[PDB]
Amino acid sequence: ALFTGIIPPVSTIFTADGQLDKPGTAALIDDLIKAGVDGLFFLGSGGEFSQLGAEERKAIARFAIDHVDRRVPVLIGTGGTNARETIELSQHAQQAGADGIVVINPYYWKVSEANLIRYFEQVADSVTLPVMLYNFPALTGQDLTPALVKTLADSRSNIIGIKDTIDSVAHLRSMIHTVKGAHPHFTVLCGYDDHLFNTLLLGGDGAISASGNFAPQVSVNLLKAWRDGDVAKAAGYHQTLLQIPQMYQLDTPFVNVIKEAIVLCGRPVSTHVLPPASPLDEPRKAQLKTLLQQLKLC
Amino acid sequence: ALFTGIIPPVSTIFTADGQLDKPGTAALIDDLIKAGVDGLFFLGSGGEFSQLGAEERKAIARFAIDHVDRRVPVLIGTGGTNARETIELSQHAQQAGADGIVVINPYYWKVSEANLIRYFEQVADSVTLPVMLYNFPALTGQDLTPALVKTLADSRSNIIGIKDTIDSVAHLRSMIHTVKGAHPHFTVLCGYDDHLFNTLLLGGDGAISASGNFAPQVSVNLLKAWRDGDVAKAAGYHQTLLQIPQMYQLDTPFVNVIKEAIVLCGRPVSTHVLPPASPLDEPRKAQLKTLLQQLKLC
Amino acid sequence: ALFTGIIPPVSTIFTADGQLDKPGTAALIDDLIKAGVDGLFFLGSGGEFSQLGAEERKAIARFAIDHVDRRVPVLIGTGGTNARETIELSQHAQQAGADGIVVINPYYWKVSEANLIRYFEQVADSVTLPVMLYNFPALTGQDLTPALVKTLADSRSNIIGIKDTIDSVAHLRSMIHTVKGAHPHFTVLCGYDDHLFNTLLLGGDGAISASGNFAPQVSVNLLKAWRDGDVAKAAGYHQTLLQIPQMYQLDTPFVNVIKEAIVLCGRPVSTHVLPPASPLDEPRKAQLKTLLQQLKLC
Amino acid sequence: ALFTGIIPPVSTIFTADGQLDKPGTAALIDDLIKAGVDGLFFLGSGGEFSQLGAEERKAIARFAIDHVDRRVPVLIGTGGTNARETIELSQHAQQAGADGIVVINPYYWKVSEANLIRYFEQVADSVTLPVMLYNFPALTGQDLTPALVKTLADSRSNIIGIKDTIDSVAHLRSMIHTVKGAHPHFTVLCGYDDHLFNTLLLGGDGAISASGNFAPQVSVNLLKAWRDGDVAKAAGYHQTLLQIPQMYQLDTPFVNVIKEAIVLCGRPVSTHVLPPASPLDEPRKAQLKTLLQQLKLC
């Protein structure tokens, strides 16, 4: 089973003119590795993959992979709407030394099933890396159903997991039963902080979630506690993760909220975000603060 | 805080010709009281309130109240689309000795907000009983938003709780913060089994959920365990409740599934259901069995 | 082909104390028959069927049928959530002398396909009257798909039409091709005023729509014009019907709006409506007026 | 009033190796200009804008503008998910000699209203060209509401119109009343073929729709007929446009369908499409054929 445990969708730190902030992004990466995370996921939703051009994503992936220097497994998110671009980026990910790619379904056209299976097969056939599907229906307008994920895992041996980004116990549970029942080492990670504990208890594999950026100790210690069999301690950490997603309500996109939380939790990085995200206002920054304080995270 | 803890939406046992089965529905009630539940909810969704005429619901409520004989608090579900009928049934609930009513938003027309607030105020003003709101958007097509529930609790002192029926941690959490933050003794119960533990850990009040019919020990012991501070034991029970809602996938309406589960778990009652529900087929009955067995419930 | 042409969903006139207003409802009926409509539909959505108890609907149907006295075909809307009640009401419609029933899909539980087909078959088998399906997905949360309507017409020879209530050319066109291609004399009526002309031009059969209450001349003359081959004149009337549905935005439910429009267009009836509908306020009454005036309808 | 009448979203012809087909795309353009259209819209949805990288869209826009050589007004679709890319592409559109841009709302993140207004203002401020909004909620997951389109037209003098892509008379009518009532020369075009006639009769301005590629005579003649006051002739053409959108059901994306229809209607171009669209199969190609034949278009 590949890419299990706590794997944060790392934020891409930018300068004020919108270029990659190498020192900042590097410090972030080093904090998270130091925190004990089980991998790193660059150019996810929170990574602002969809506000970036192709060449920029290449640059960011290459840098990110380099700085990690194989200390933990790296995942590059290579998806989008342009299928050829997905292949290009996916192969580049491979050449640049990534351990795997994370591919979302195309999100402008909601593609026929035949075409969706065709698309995921083509991108899977373009690399020899393990490939993680990415479901996020709230944003895509098209759900990767458990049945269809099972069709994809049945078709290609390199389709070996999924980040399931949905506030739904039923989708997580059904994903686990349908897909892991057919493919026991196929990996199921939830996309939201408040579903980690549940995902574990359902027979799933972990979380890729935003709180990994500014508070990875909480998810890392939950996982460690669960693995040591100490469920009580694990549910205690869970109690914090249940509360954390209130902050994501402060803006849309909440990519700015995450960065501001990194700062407030002790890592001073530029919080610049790419449009059409925008700087979080001081009132809401302050409201974010009281929240992090309330939960004993700063 | 009224109507906290484990309060099952009790199944209405029917004869083959569709009349109330007094011996069966009585035995069911007695099992649940014996199991240690904290109240009983008749004529909920699972109670088949919406396949029943007015006079039948009256008869069922009266019988149900009488059999309970004040051993636990009783809630009568009195809602529907016909507002006058809701008042009638709500007052009758009162005369018949109910401890409270449970009122869903009208579910054919999606009511303007002005009318929805007006409707709930008029029903609340028709009784001196405590009143529970009932959110179930999947079926109603209109969500009782935390903000709006807070407007209702602000308006009427007898609107003192909610059964929130949705597979969503965000709605439960937002419901607790918005409404309980403004009204600390306002009751928040979840409508699904897999959300009980989470509901508790979020500062909510319990569950009204189907598994209370055929497996109330699980929810009752979870609650007891959590109240005694033993979180580990409580999460263990939670592990079973995470799995239970698979069975509700076997039919729609799954009212039949619940009854069949009552039987399989040791209480031999007629499983007749009112159309347009229908008898569960033997294959799926058998699939329900293996599931209950897998989970150590029969 | 049964129930073609202009068939209004007639408003049920109530007194200020909420009783059937026999003089008013009778005058309304007589105006419409005099306007040249092709039938009458009582206890539709606009008829307030879902705010009424069973016995009241019987009383209203019986009265309505009796007053019409076979001058035009009468349709009784007998649907709801309670299947047994649907049969009861449907048979009563028959005994009372109705020419057909109009049956919507159950709208609380969104019923499995197997159960939905089973339900419509059972109701169709309970009478010898022609049966009109009623699709209104915005309110039901479950669409009667063309394919499924074709399965129902294929199963029962007395399922002979549909009122399709949806703002969509695609659903209307798809309904016509799938169902009428298989069953040429199967009737397709649209539920909205602005789709009548289109429904005709697509090879459909007419309209059941609210404007038939207060402005049936417009739809009746459109139909007449189209039947005489004078498309220009028919599109002229269409121009008015395109504008009319603005008024339905004034309240929800807009059953009040329709009644107020009946008055303003020259028929002085009580505009009382059953909760949770409410009296339209004077401002909006006035806005309704300017609208009817600007369109040359009062 | 800018960009009124029939303005096709032109297909981008690609070679078999996926490069811009200059001869084919040029012949297409010349057929449409010859057909009497009122403008041309490159890199729309049908233009495959979202399967293309930035540099390719520039190349296509430049070529398209140059070939048109000011014979009709040209619109370049410059939108997407990357805001900076939208500005870049928008300015380039300007330098390259475009008469206007067409900008859709960002369609991955569904952006807060504040950020959406901010985004459209920023892209509008990056050019001096007239700017056409593009609503397509089925694909975007976020509707450009009439109210909001009115807030945008109120804010920026160069936001002067909209292509409204939705199967809904209400949205079109509400768009016209809200926005044109405030801004009489603000242009409202519908995105679907079957809504053109209605859009005209509602006081709107025309259509940008796929049938303009392979059958522009129909829309052009409808417009001409309506403008000459001959409504009958105009509704006749409308009858064909009502039927045409059946073909778009043959695939998703239906970009392939449109190209195949161009061929079948007499213009032999490469029908290659960019993934994740794929070649239409022969059966469906043949079904497309019978359809075009049925309607007297080949």
UniProtKB/Swiss-Prot annotation, chains A, B, C, D:
Function description: Catalyzes the formation of 2-keto-3-deoxy-gluconate (KDG) from pyruvate and glyceraldehyde. May also function as a 2-dehydro-3-deoxy-D-pentonate aldolase. Overexpression leads to increased growth (over 2 hours) in the presence of the antibiotics norfloxacin, ampicillin and streptomycin.
PROSITE patterns, A to Z: DHDPS_1 (PS00665), DHDPS_2 (PS00666)
Additional observations: Part of prophage CP4-6.
Lineage of the species this protein comes from: Bacteria, Pseudomonadati, Pseudomonadota, Gammaproteobacteria, Enterobacterales
Chief place where the protein resides: cytoplasm
Domain of life assignment: Bacteria
Disruption phenotype: Disruption mutant has reduced ability to catabolize D-xylonic acid. YjhH-yagE double mutant cannot use D-xylonate as the sole source of carbon.
Protein source organism: Escherichia coli (strain K12)
Subcellular location, record wording: Cytoplasm
CDD domains in the cross-refs: DHDPS-like
Catalysed reactions, semicolon-separated: 2-dehydro-3-deoxy-D-gluconate = D-glyceraldehyde + pyruvate; 2-dehydro-3-deoxy-D-arabinonate = glycolaldehyde + pyruvate
Keyword Lyase: yes
Listed name of the protein: Putative 2-dehydro-3-deoxy-D-gluconate aldolase YagE
Record-level GO BP terms: aldonic acid catabolic process
Family membership: Belongs to the DapA family.
Name of one Pfam family that matches: DHDPS
A GO CC annotation given for this chain: cytosol
Induction, per UniProt: Expression is repressed by the transcriptional regulator XynR.
Description of how the protein assembles with itself and partners: A dimer of dimers.
Active site, per annotation: 45 (charge relay system), 108 (charge relay system), 134 (proton donor), 163 (schiff-base intermediate with substrate)
Alphabetized UniProt keyword annotations: Cytoplasm, Lyase, Schiff base
Enzymatic class: lyase
EC number annotated for this UniProt entry: 4.1.2.51, 4.1.2.28
GO molecular function, one term: 2-dehydro-3-deoxy-D-pentonate aldolase activity
Gene3D superfamilies found in the cross-reference section: Aldolase class I
Keyword check for Lyase: yes
